[PDB]
Every structure is written in structure tokens, then in C-alpha cells.
Nucleic acid binder design. Structure first.
Lengths: 142, 59, 182, 126
RNA sequence: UCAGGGUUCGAUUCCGGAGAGGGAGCCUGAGAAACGGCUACCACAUCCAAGGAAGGCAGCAGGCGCGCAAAUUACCCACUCCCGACCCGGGGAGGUAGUGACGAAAAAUAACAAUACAGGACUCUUUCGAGGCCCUGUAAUUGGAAUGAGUCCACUUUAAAUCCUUUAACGAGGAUCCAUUGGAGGGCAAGUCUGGUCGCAGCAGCCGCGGUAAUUCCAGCUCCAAUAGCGUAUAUUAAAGUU
């Protein structure tokens, strides 16, 4: 309680709630829209780009590994993202200065696992999925 | 060895044994797949004292 | 134009206790899939939702009388409920198994020739039974109470009168053209 | 095979000069007999001869053993020939309409817009 | 979507409104500030003998471009209605087919005996042991029976046809007329089996696995879940009495 409970206090309630909703964390990203503007995506699930150069990222402690990322610039916003390559040895199935299709990690703007600075992964290298390259259901077209 | 192109991919898949042993069998589907699942778990009659043994085990 | 989704999924994805009940229920009636179970259980919970309305509102209001009467009539017409009951409270005493009993494949087995429940489903689909005069391929019929004594084989089919199948009629010609002289 | 034509919804339609009913058929052999065969039998059930019988419909129920259609019986030929949908007269021939169709018509029209005072010229051009 | 109270979404088949590249003006008519009418500017773009002339797909198809992202330059006025001087003409409105795992409904991928082992109620017997019944899988073959999937004459369907339903003749022995998608340390239903790798390579929404005996990696085997579907990304609700 600690609040008015008149029968004519609809205004003082409905204007108060509309204000104290802005302090909520979820709401403040959704409704200012600065989230979208800042994102390298337009708010689309995927996006398409062109590879710039392979890189390797050294994982945050205590784990030690090299995580074989790429760096890609996008078509639809012309700006750059550092993107993970999943499975094993799929670095080889990516070849520089071609198109790729990117996709978010699965934690909505926040780095996943022990790798820092990488919020994206890669799905298609030339209309052929990393899954099908790895399994052998399709082959890289050269 | 920790080393041996330890800055580069392929080191646990390109140097394993290659196995391609497989069976020939016809597995059941739909109705019959549930029929075997029902009988094999619950009615044979199943019970044996103090059993705890799971549906798999290497015991 | 108009569509709806009949089944619903379980709230929890895994729970040994729940899974065992769904398994043993499928074993009993020889059902194909768990989607064929949740479908039934939707029907029950639907009827239970409608019922829970009518119990709150005084008797001798027109909504409660007319609805209840015609609801209970339908429950009696399929015979999952007695007329020695027929009160709205006894709607809530209904449960899953009574529905599944009224299914065609259950009634084929119960009142006609089969060797197991697994046999009976195959007979319905391979068109060797009828319901009064009419072939069916649906073992999920639900069978009105009056009609549980008109389940018969098909009037043309190898079971009952009608032409011999192509396993028989092959082998009959195997005594004259399959091994008769060539 | 076994052919049973059974009479249902008898109406004497004086305004169109016909008699319209339902054509209820039972046949446990091969269900669905030719429509030609049906109108022979119905001709000799009201004695009106098969040049004023018209039938259509004939969807066969699941499991066979029954088929149901819809049939008319006209008093005279000229009353049928006048009333009758065009395709139903051409169904068992005594009528036709030549149709080119529907691209030859439009392409002629659009060419005709360009000329004036002569309608026959564009048609002559082939 | 949801117990009650709510929250989010509504470009999109009904109804109302606004607009035909952007602006402005206007003729005709009962009705228009009309654009498959006209006149001008501005922005575009085409033909030309260079003197001039002509244009507006947010109509149906189709193409380019844009992007994560979206179908046939098909048939036809038979239905439904509309328009006309009119029973008779016309209508990419509209109806029909094609492409179509958006999504929804239906439910095939083997059912039954023989032998073979196996279990337990039951009976006889002092126990031992035997008989015998109910069912189970599981091997070996089989045996008889059944059916559409397909192929396919015929009827039927309809504007004409397809499909469907209806019907000949062919059409099943498990090897083929082949079910996959994910996972098996905990959350959370399922292996401390074997080989390889040995903080390397990789896995891991989260907690964490990997440094020579890896229940988590790479494979095989086995098992579990869901099942003609299942996984992944993002928006959004419930979970949130964390508005």
C-alpha cells in the first residue's frame, strides 16, 4: 500500500505507473529504440556481409583456446562485426572476400561462453550451410 | 602433444581412426515403435526384486 | 477461412511420471502417436471448462437449464455417462478412459473378430469393416451408443462374401500357370 | 451391372416447362454407370423418349454403392433447346459455339482501335 | 497469450478514409479537383529525317533494384454479380488450374499362426522334480491371409480438363515398396562401454568440461525424446506479486 485509494484517484495512479515503467531495464531498451540504431543489424534475425579477414580471439580465463573468428562488413549498414565460426575446422570452409550470412548468438546482445566481443555466428558461406559442409550432404562449389 | 600446429585447425578429426561399421536392420516406426517400447519396458511380465537398473547400463 | 488447433502440448517437457502414464495409455488402446492422446485429453478438458460455468448461476435461469440439458443429452448419446446419473456434477466424474472405449478400433476388438487391438486397427484401414452400410477408414470414429451393434464386416471383401484377394487368387492360378506346366 | 434408378423432390416446374427431381442410384457392382445409360432408363419411366432428358451431378458417395445426381425432363424439344445452358446442349450434341478464343478476340480489338471506318481490314490481315 | 485482473499486436479479404512520381489548376457531367480525362511546372525517361512527337503497372502477369524475406508473361465468362439502347454483347471483377513443409485437419511404413528358447500365476509331488496355463519378447525360417503406394483400360468430374470418390488388370516376404531430426555430467527423460585427441583441437543458452584412465571433445556401439516432422535466429506473451 502506502498509496492513495480514493474513488477519484484514477489520474494520479495512471500517470504514476506510466512514469515508473521507464525505470524498468527491458522497457527502456524497447521503447527508446536506441538499441536498434546502435545495433549493426536493423533488428533482422540475420544479415549478409562480405568477409574482410580471418582473425583469432583468445578466450577469457580460465579457459585457453583460440576460437577462430572472422571479421565481416555488412551490406545493409556498412559496418563491421566479429563473428564466430562453429564446429571444428569450418575455418577452412570459409574463404576470404566472399559473402556469408550471419546470425545472432542466442543471448540477444551479450557475448556467449568464454569468448568475449563476439555476439554473432555464421550459417552460410555460398548458399551452402556449414552443417551440410561438415556432414557432407553438400560440397563447396568451386 | 600440446603443440603441432596448435595455432591452426584440424587436429582431432583429421587424425582419428575411421570407422564405418553399420548394421542392416529394419527399424519399426509409427504404431509399432510404441508397441515395442510398451512391452519392453512394462509387460513381459517385467518385475524382479529391488530393480533400479535403468533402460541402459553397461553393467 | 476458419481453422483451429485441436491438441495442446504438455507444460513441462520431461517428467518421468507423466511420460509413463502417456506410454501405458497408448499401450492399452494401440494408438499411433502421443498427438492422438493429447487430442482426446483436450476434448475432456474442454467439456470440463464448459461445465464449470454452469455450476455457478442459480437454477431456473434460462442459460443454465437449456445448455445443461442439451450438453448432458450428448454425453448420454455416446454413452460415456448414465441417465441414472445425469446431473452436472457427474460431468466432472468423467475421465480419460471412457472416451477411448467408444473409439471404433476398441469396439471392433470388443464386439467383432480380431486377435489383438493391433489387428483391429489394420482391419478398419484395409476397409474390411463397415458401420451399418458404410465403409470407414477412421479408427478414431467415436461410435454412438445405438450403433454399437451394427459393426459388421464389409459386404464385399474376403472376410464375409466377396471376391478372393490377390494373395489367394495368385496362388490358385499357381496350381495351373505358376507350377501347372510352367 | 445392377442398375437401380429410384425416383425424391418431384416438382412440376410449369414456368420453365420441365419436371425436376433427384436421380438416386444404387448399384453394388461398379458404381457410376454412363449418363447416357441413365437417361435411357428414365425415358421409359415417364415415357418421354431420350431427347428431352438431361441429367448432371453424379458424385459418388464414399465406399460406393450409391450415387446421386439431378435430372430434368422437358415436355418438348424446343423448350429444352431454348432454356438449357449452352454447354449442356453441346454436352450431347445439337449445339456448339466456335471459340477461338480469348486472345484472338482481344488482339483483334486493340488493332481495330487504331483504324477508323473499316472493321473488316484488321480481320483480313490474319 | 491468459485462473481472476491484464499485456502485446491489428500493412492484409468486412466497414470508413486518403492517394495515384511530387505540386497546382481545370473541362465534361446528376455525381470528379478524376489521373487506364485534360493543361502547366518540378523530378524522371523514350522516339526523331533534330523541324517536332509521345509517357506514368501503389490494375493482372512479368522484369530490374532493394534486401534476412515472398508464385504462372497459364485457361475461361459455366458459376457469382456488374455494365449497355439490351433475354442475345462485354468484364485479368470473378471462377478454374500451376508453384506452395506459412499454417490447419486425416493417418501408411506389417497384422496373424508354427517351431525355438524365455518368464510367471496354476496343478501334482515330502522336498527334488514334472505337468500345465497365461502371456511375452527373441532367433530361424516359413506358411497362409490382407492392402494401397504405384502402374493403368473405363466410368465420373467440368466451360474444357486435372484431382477426388468409383472401378478392371498388374502391384509386398523384411535384404526390399528402407524415417528422420536432436540428445545422453546437472537443470531434464537417456551409458563411469571401447578406440582416438590430451588446456591442443573443440564442446558448453547457464553452471562448467579438455593439463595422458575425458560419463560433457572426435568416432563406433548402445540407449532416450519427438515422429512426417525436428533444430536454429529474432520479435512478443505466459513464467513476473521482478511494474
Amino acid at each position: 500500500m502506502g498509496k492513495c485509494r480514493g474513488l477519484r484517484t484514477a489520474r494520479k495512479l495512471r500517470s504514476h505507473r506510466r512514469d515508473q515503467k521507464w525505470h524498468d531495464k527491458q522497457y527502456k531498451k524497447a521503447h527508446l529504440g536506441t538499441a536498434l540504431k546502435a545495433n549493426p543489424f536493423g533488428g533482422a534475425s540475420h544479415a549478409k556481409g562480405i568477409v574482410l579477414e580471418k582473425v583469432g580471439v583468445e578466450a577469457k580465463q580460465p579457459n585457453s583456446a583460440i576460437r577462430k573468428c572472422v571479421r565481416v562488413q555488412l551490406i545493409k549498414n556498412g559496418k563491421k562485426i566479429t563473428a564466430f565460426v562453429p564446429n571444428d575446422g569450418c575455418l577452412n570452409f570459409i574463404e576470404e572476400n566472399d559473402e556469408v550470412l550471419v546470425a545472432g548468438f542466442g543471448r540477444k546482445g551479450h557475448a556467449v561462453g568464454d569468448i568475449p566481443g563476439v555476439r554473432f555466428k555464421v550459417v552460410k558461406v555460398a548458399n551452402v550451410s556449414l552443417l551440410a559442409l561438415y556432414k557432407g550432404k553438400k560440397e563447396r562449389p568451386r | 602433444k600440446v603443440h603441432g600446429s596448435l595455432a591452426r585447425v584440424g587436429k582431432v578429426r583429421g587424425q582419428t581412426l575411421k570407422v564405418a561399421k553399420q548394421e542392416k536392420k529394419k527399424k519399426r516406426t509409427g504404431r509399432a515403435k510404441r508397441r515395442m517400447q510398451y512391452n519392453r519396458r512394462f509387460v513381459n511380465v517385467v518385475p524382479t526384486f529391488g530393480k533400479k537398473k535403468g533402460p541402459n547400463a553397461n553393467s | 477461412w476458419v481453422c483451429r488447433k485441436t491438441y495442446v502440448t504438455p507444460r513441462r517437457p520431461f517428467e518421468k511420471s507423466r511420460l509413463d502414464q502417456e506410454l501405458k495409455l497408448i499401450g492399452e488402446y494401440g494408438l499411433r502417436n502421443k498427438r492422438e492422446v493429447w487430442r482426446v485429453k483436450f476434448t475432456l478438458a474442454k467439456i470440463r471448462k464448459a461445465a464449470r460455468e454452469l455450476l455457478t448461476l442459480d437454477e431456473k435461469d434460462p442459460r443454465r437449464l437449456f445448455e445443461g440439458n442439451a450438453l448432458l443429452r450428448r454425453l448420454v448419446r455416446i454413452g460415456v455417462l448414465d441417465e441414472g446419473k445425469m446431473k452436472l456434477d457427474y460431468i466432472l466424474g468423467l475421465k480419460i478412459e471412457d472416451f477411448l472405449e467408444r473409439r471404433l478400433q476398441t469396439q471392433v476388438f470388443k464386439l467383432g473378430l480380431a486377435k489383438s487391438i493391433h489387428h483391429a486397427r489394420v482391419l478398419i484401414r484395409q476397409r474390411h469393416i463397415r458401420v451399418r452400410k458404410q465403409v470407414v477408414n477412421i479408427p478414431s470414429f467415436i461410435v454412438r451408443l445405438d450403433s454399437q451393434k451394427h459393426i459388421d464386416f464389409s459386404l464385399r471383401s474376403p472376410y464375409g462374401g466377396g471376391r478372393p484377394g490377390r494373395v489367394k487368387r495368385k496362388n490358385a492360378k499357381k496350381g495351373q500357370g505358376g507350377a501347372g506346366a510352367g | 451391372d445392377t442398375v437401380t434408378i429410384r425416383t425424391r423432390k418431384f416438382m412440376t416446374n410449369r414456368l420453365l416447362q420441365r419436371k425436376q427431381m433427384v436421380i438416386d442410384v444404387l448399384h453394388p457392382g461398379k458404381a457410376t454407370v454412363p449418363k447416357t445409360e441413365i437417361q435411357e432408363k428414365l425415358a421409359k419411366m415417364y415415357k418421354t423418349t431420350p431427347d428431352v432428358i438431361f441429367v448432371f451431378g453424379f458424385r459418388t458417395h464414399f465406399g460406393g454403392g450409391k450415387t446421386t445426381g439431378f435430372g430434368m425432363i422437358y415436355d418438348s424439344l424446343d423448350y429444352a433447346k431454348k432454356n438449357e445452358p449452352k454447354h449442356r446442349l453441346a454436352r450431347h450434341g445439337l449445339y456448339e459455339k466456335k471459340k477461338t478464343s480469348r486472345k484472338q478476340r482481344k488482339e483483334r480489338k486493340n488493332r481495330m482501335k487504331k483504324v477508323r471506318g473499316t472493321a473488316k481490314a484488321n480481320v483480313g490481315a490474319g
